[PDB]
Each structure stands twice: as C-alpha cells, then as structure tokens.
Structure 1
C-alpha cells in the first residue's frame, strides 16, 4: 500500500491568466489547456491574484469580476486552486511581456514620500513593493500597508467564499515582497544587477534607517551605521572587506547588522501572517509563504547573496530554520524553489549549491513540523529535471507499506503554456505526474485540511533565533529517485 507516497502536483497558470486590464479574456484557450492538464492527472492550478488589478481604482474599490470568472472555470474543470495574494509588481524587467504594477494610487503616495519603497545605498527606489518599514505606518489615505493587505484578503475571502466552501481554493500563499517572496529586492536584474553578483543591502529607506538607529541605541551603540565596505551589486565576495573570507561580516557590528536586517524580514512575515490567519480562520486552507532560492555563493563562507536577500545563513547559523520557527505558530507552510536543479548544471563561478540549499530548507521546515512544498526555479521540460524534482519530493524514496519518513506536501510546476502541453514536452510531463502520484490515479480527496486554527502565542525574535544554532545536518537524501520517469 503505497498511497502515503502520493505528492500532489499543481501547475502555475500564465502570468496573463487575467489581462492587464483586469478582464478575463482567454477563457477558451485556458479551458483547452486545462483539458490537457486533466488528461495528465494534475491535482490543481496556482494563480497570482494581482493587487494592482483588483484594487487599481482606488482604496477599497475591489473589482473581483475577472478572478471570479477564472475561478469558476477552474472549478468546472474539476481542479483545485492555490491563490497567491500578490502584493507586488508583475514584470517590469527588460523583455517581460506581462507588466502589472501595484496600484497607481499607492504609488502616488511615493511622490511626497519616496521612502515607501525599498531603497539602496545609491538612493535608487525599487517600486515593486512597499518597504516593510511602512507595515504599520498609516500613510495610505489613513491605512498602513498591513491594513491594506488584511483588507484585501478580507475582501477576497468574502467574494470567494463559495469556492472556499466548495473545496476549490485549498491554499493561500501570502506575498511578502518582490516576486511575492519574503526577501529584499537585492538582485535587481534590469537595473544594475546580473547573475551571479553578490547583490546589495536594500535598507536605506528612511523608515528602516530610523529602525536601525533605534535598535543600535537600545544596545548602547548609537554611533553604528550600516556597513560601508560591502562593494556593489556585481561584485564577488573577495572584492569586498565585508564579504571576503575572514571579512567584517564576522565582526560584532557585522553580526548585529545582519541579524537586524534578517530579523526585520522575519517580523514582517510574522505580522502579516497573523492578519492572514485571522482572515482565513475556520476555512479548510493551508497558508503559505514563498522563500526565494538564493543558491549562488552558497559554497563560500559569507553566503553573500543569501545575506543581501535577507537570509542570514552561514556554516554555523541556520538562517532558514529561524524562518521556519516563526511560521510554526501560524501552521504556515514553506513554498521553496530550485527543486529541479542539480549542482552540476550551474556555472562554476557562481559558487552555487541548489541541491544543498533545497536539502537545508526542507530539513528546516520538517524539523519545525511544517508542511513544505516546492517549485522549479527555471523552465524545464526534460526527464532529468523531473527526476531531480522526484528525488526532492521523496528524499528517502518509496515506503512500500505506509507514508514515508519525509515528503513534499506538494509541487507546483512553473508554468502552463501551449509549449508544455504538446509533443514530447507533454509526454514527459504526464509521466512525471504519474511518478509523483506513485503511479496511482488522481485522488481528489488527498491531503484534506482541518479548519484553520488561530495562530498560537506570539513568540519573540529571541525565541525564534534559538532555532539558528546549533546548525544541524540535513536529513539524508538519495542521490537519485527510485521512481524515475524512464
């Protein structure tokens, strides 16, 4: 009896599932594509629910018409649905086809207060998301950013109640930064960064500067400032005194700054998840966050790119198990990425270890008792990619007589297109879904959700940080799946 081995597979819809004009205009094409996904046994789909589309008119002027039409189509296809609360810009990089900013009336606040945006040491404003520094600042016609997020989720719940009650919507992923990820915009690809640069610390908005000054004063160092030996976006670690081997990241001041920077991200997630949990209390849904997969520089001591993204991860400090501990009271899950990547596929100069990073994040989640899901980072259609995902989905392989010791709660494939559902690409994908399901048919009843309970007691940052050390080895992962595509 191998049923406990089944891993659900979701497919991300196109970024244009709803048009840039907040109209549902590609229903027939989507219906035809969904027939191919149903033919393949897919459990469900996932979609960005764009803040800039729905609350684009003005404050509280929510227009759910297009999303309700999409959700009805998905329901009528017999598929489940994962919904992302997408509080960020879609696109805006060179060559991006689908471009959806956050609401214009929100951005208008930035004309008199440009510090609503994450800002780098050059002064450059990132306009994709509101700084965590304004989470609780009532700058937006009397509302704070957290209040806008809570109010959007409340309207979503009210409008989409029928889909919740029908068991269509099964997961709410709460966007927490650029690209919906709980991170800083430290690698701005169309604006001065190229892979595999170390990135930069994006903490120069006036709200975050004042927060650092207060934190530094509370520990008797009012004179401390952000590190000034950190180089720039496209440096490598040895170009800098901060990130080099034996560099100033190790110093008392460096540790204080890196803790402050990464803790603020953790506090940002905790406060927004608390509000999301209040909204969805009693509904049979999973709440999730998305952690970005910063695999470059993972092999060097400073983990420089993780540091600048906000993940304070070192040989002897688990910067993901802290995040996981924060999620525990919410019963929130981690949605990770890079599940398709092998280390051998990465360039040598990137000092990149996606396999080890995946193992670390999955192991951290599992040690805190969380559900963990994953995505692929980059487009892949080939058997090797599917077999790498399969390894990560069941790291110990098939248990012949019950549930395995560890397994992903789900996998979401990025992303549906016409190219996926034809030819050899489609053949490879269908076989992948079979293998993820342990060669069983689709189970519409799998992984039922209890009504969401209220978050447990708020725990302090000090309590969260107990998870950082000692750093533990990951659980053992097989080198290759025992159930390959063939």
Structure 2
C-alpha cells in the first residue's frame, strides 16, 4: 500500500525559537514533539526568520537558536522543512508572535519608502520588500535577491550537518507576504476584511516605473493603472473594473493584468534560480507557497485573485503559468487551501475552495511538479481531515498500484497544546494513519536526489503559453475512500502528556 503513503508534517509554533533568536521553549517543544511522532508524523516545518538571523546587521548571521532547534528535531527523528522566511510575522491571520524584517533594512526604507509594496493611497507595507527592488542594489551595495541568496548560502554553510544527514528535506523559499508568491492585496493591517476584493499593490516608484516603461513598449505610454478598481473592501459589482464586462476585459486592463501577474512569475523565477544554485547538489527539494484566494472565485472576474497577482479566469489558467516557471528549477508547489469545502464559506464571498484546490493541483500535476498542501485555517475536525484526505488522493487508494495523482505531502497548521492533547489528538493521529494509507510511518520513503541545476531560462512569453486554453481538472472523487472512521481508528484511545 506504500504507493499511497502521503507524508504528514506539522508546522511548529510561529515562535519555535523566540522573538530574539533565543531558543527558549525547548522542553515544551521536546514534550510537544514527543506525541507528534507517537502520532507517526513524518517531519515538521519551521520558519527561519530573516528578521531573527541577519537582524543585527549586513551579513551578521546568528544561527544559534536555530542550530539548537533543529538539534531537537534531529533528535526526535523528524524530517524538517525549513521556510526561508524573508517576511514579517504579524499582520496576517494567526500571527501571534511579531517578528518584522531586519531593522537595518527597515532603516533603508526610511530613506527610500518605495522599497515596500505601496497601495494607491501610498501606504507602505513593511512586511515584504517590493519585487521592484529585486535587482536594485540599495541595501548598502546589495540588491534584494543578492541579500536573499546570501541569506540562503549562509544557511547552507551553517546547517550542513543537518543537510547531510537528511534532516532538512525541503527548503521553502518565501517570496511574498506569509512567504507566499503574491502581492499584499488583502492586508488585515490596512483595514481590508474578508471577503473584500483587495487592491492592486503596485504603486512604489520601481514598479510604478517598470509599468510605464512596459506601456510605451507596446505603443501605449499614455496608459496608467486602473482608476476604476475600487478599494479593499468593495465587491466586484461596485467597481467598474471588476464588474461583468468591465475594464478587466479591455486592452488596457488585460495588459495591466498581464504585467502585474508576470512580475510575480519573474520575481519567483529569479530568486529560485539562486536558491537552486545555493542548494545545488543537496538531498533537498525547493518549494514555494501559493496563496489560496478562494473568495470571488465563482464570479467571472475572479477579482481577489487578480489583485493578489494570480491572473486566473475561466479561459486563462493563472496557476499553470506559475508551475511552468517552476518546472526548470525542479521546484514544487505548496498550495494552502486543502481543508476547506465550498459548503463552509459565507455565500456572499462567492468562494470556491474545492475548485481552486482542483485547479492548482491539476496545473501542477500537468507540469509534472510535486504538489503539496497545507490547510489555511485552524482545524481539528474529521471533516477537515476527510476533505484533506480527499485532496491528497483525489482518486483515492490504488491498492493495485500507486495512484495517478497524489500529493507529495501535507503540512498541518499548527503545533499547539490542543493538537497533542486528547480528542483532537486521537483524531489527528487517525488522520495521519489514513494519510499514510494506514501503513506505519516510514522515513525511508520519498528519498530525494541531489538537487540538479535549474534548466535553461525560458522567456515570459514561453511560460505564458500554459495559460491558454484552461484545461479541465483531474476528476476529483467527492469524498475520500479512506475517511477518519470517527473518533477512534486503529489503536483505540491514547491518553498522555499535558504541558506544565
């Protein structure tokens, strides 16, 4: 039944190593990572916050709390997915700990405000560096991807012992807010609230100039940004841009959207080129996280997706363009909406979770990429685990083989006292059982090969030919064929350690 084994990973507290590079909660974590392996979890995932390590200065890396944390993990026998977290913790949902980007970068920003994504009003979003300064050498003679690449080269030099023994199996290079390839279009920070459409975050002078230069390239210098796209909390109908047969379909608006959405491809391309020549040769896999912007999916404009950077429509696959860019790099997609079901989203959201999971996992599987998921919200119900299991093996168990399509692995959000305690614990455990096709945990499964080098760079126009025509999804079963059962599952009822 091994072909059907899907690895489960838990995501560690946002603060596995505390708010100032001091690994503190080690004994708690030691007890918390004890039950997780009794549950049979394959490995864990932590952020390697850029603001904690090079916080103190240019190239002043302090891997100390982090060498100790991974020490704990290795000792627990767990695989580790590390997230190269070049973004601020605090601002999004579920962000309790608050870790900003490096103070010395934020100080550069004081001098040049345009280094942070800027909305139409001119509000500076401090949580991630605009993709416009990727190749702008203004961080004291270092450009942002130089900075991103030196941060990852240093991670390799210092974490080598873990990279050799095979504890670190996946590097997830973050490329935007929450470490996701996208724009900060729905910033709870700036008074956006779900299911609002969000805004186009492309007003800083670097992108503000990439576009005017791009406008004149196609003969239209005169062209500006969408005047009619509304505000954060509007609904499509309310704006002239996202309204049925609105400017999102006009030449000016198709071009804009092509630009805006291409910038994210390119950003992610550049930085992945580098993460690939850094980890080049390692038994690791490179991944990126793509948001799950399900609200306004059921409407024609797909507004929230268009503002977030994913130019997805009924006739244009905006998630297969992205996966085509990941293809050279032998990268994989890490999508985040797996636990939802259309049933549970507010009816006015015009949200289609299930249909977004099917689109992205299908674009990815079509591009030959390994796809993996992560739930977007705190969920401890069997419903959540069965929806996940459905999405893991769309077509279900193929005991007569390995299945057509299968997720490489799932990474549950998040480790808490509540997950490893009682009821929630026996559900999670039986969930893991089932995610492994009820086989016992196997660590010598899905062994990676030394990361090859990124293949030949391919133009924008060559990655963009995957958009058209949008293909049909891969037939998804409606429920999983190996659900949670109910409360219990194989061993019974497990009872043990609290917290202190």
Q: TM-score range by the shorter chain?
A: over 0.9
Question: Offset of 1:423 from its aligned partner?
Answer: 1.3
SS of the aligned residue for 2:51 comes to helix
| Per-residue CA distance 1:422-464 (angstroms, 9 max, x = gap) | 1110010000000000010010100010100000000000000
| Per-residue CA distance 1:37-64 (angstroms, 9 max, x = gap) | 0100000000000000000110000000
Question: Offset of 1:266 from its aligned partner?
Answer: 0.2
| Per-residue CA distance 1:342-385 (angstroms, 9 max, x = gap) | 00000000000000000000000000000000000110101110
Query: Is 2:297–2:352's contact at 8 Å kept on the other side of the alignment?
Result: yes
1:335–1:96 distance in 2 versus 1, CA, 3 Å = closer
Q: 1:53-68 counterparts in 2 under 5 A? A: 53-68=52-67
Question: Offset of 1:239 from its aligned partner?
Answer: 0.3
Query: Is 2:91–2:187's contact at 8 Å kept on the other side of the alignment?
Result: no
Query: Is 1:238–1:245's contact at 8 Å kept on the other side of the alignment?
Result: yes
Q: Give the superposed CA RMSD.
A: 1.7
Equivalent residue number for residue 46 of structure 2: 47
Q: 1:294-443 counterparts in 2 under 5 A? A: 294-443=293-442
What is the number of equivalent residue pairs in this alignment? 485
Query: Is 1:266–1:323's contact at 8 Å kept on the other side of the alignment?
Result: yes
Query: Is 2:198–2:231's contact at 8 Å kept on the other side of the alignment?
Result: yes
Question: Offset of 1:96 from its aligned partner?
Answer: 4.4
Alignment TM-score, normalising by the size of structure 2: 0.96
1:272–1:96 distance in 2 versus 1, CA, 3 Å = closer
SS of the aligned residue for 1:55 comes to helix
| Per-residue CA distance 1:109-162 (angstroms, 9 max, x = gap) | 111100001000000000001000000000001000000000000000000000
Question: Offset of 1:92 from its aligned partner?
Answer: 3.8
1:322–1:94 distance in 2 versus 1, CA, 3 Å = closer
Question: Offset of 1:190 from its aligned partner?
Answer: 2.5
Query: Is 2:296–2:304's contact at 8 Å kept on the other side of the alignment?
Result: yes
Query: Is 1:342–1:354's contact at 8 Å kept on the other side of the alignment?
Result: yes
Query: Is 1:94–1:190's contact at 8 Å kept on the other side of the alignment?
Result: no
2:451 and 2:31 mapped to 1: Cα distance? 34
| Per-residue CA distance 1:289-310 (angstroms, 9 max, x = gap) | 0000000000000000000000
Q: 1:177-192 counterparts in 2 under 5 A? A: 177-192=176-191
SS of the aligned residue for 2:114 comes to helix
| Per-residue CA distance 1:368-408 (angstroms, 9 max, x = gap) | 00000000011010111000000000000100121101000
1:18–1:205 distance in 2 versus 1, CA, 3 Å = same
Query: Is 2:228–2:239's contact at 8 Å kept on the other side of the alignment?
Result: yes
Alignment TM-score, normalising by the size of structure 1: 0.99
SS of the aligned residue for 1:52 comes to coil
Query: Is 2:23–2:69's contact at 8 Å kept on the other side of the alignment?
Result: yes
2:455 and 2:186 mapped to 1: Cα distance? 34
Question: Offset of 1:16 from its aligned partner?
Answer: 1.2
4+ residue runs over 6 A deviation: none
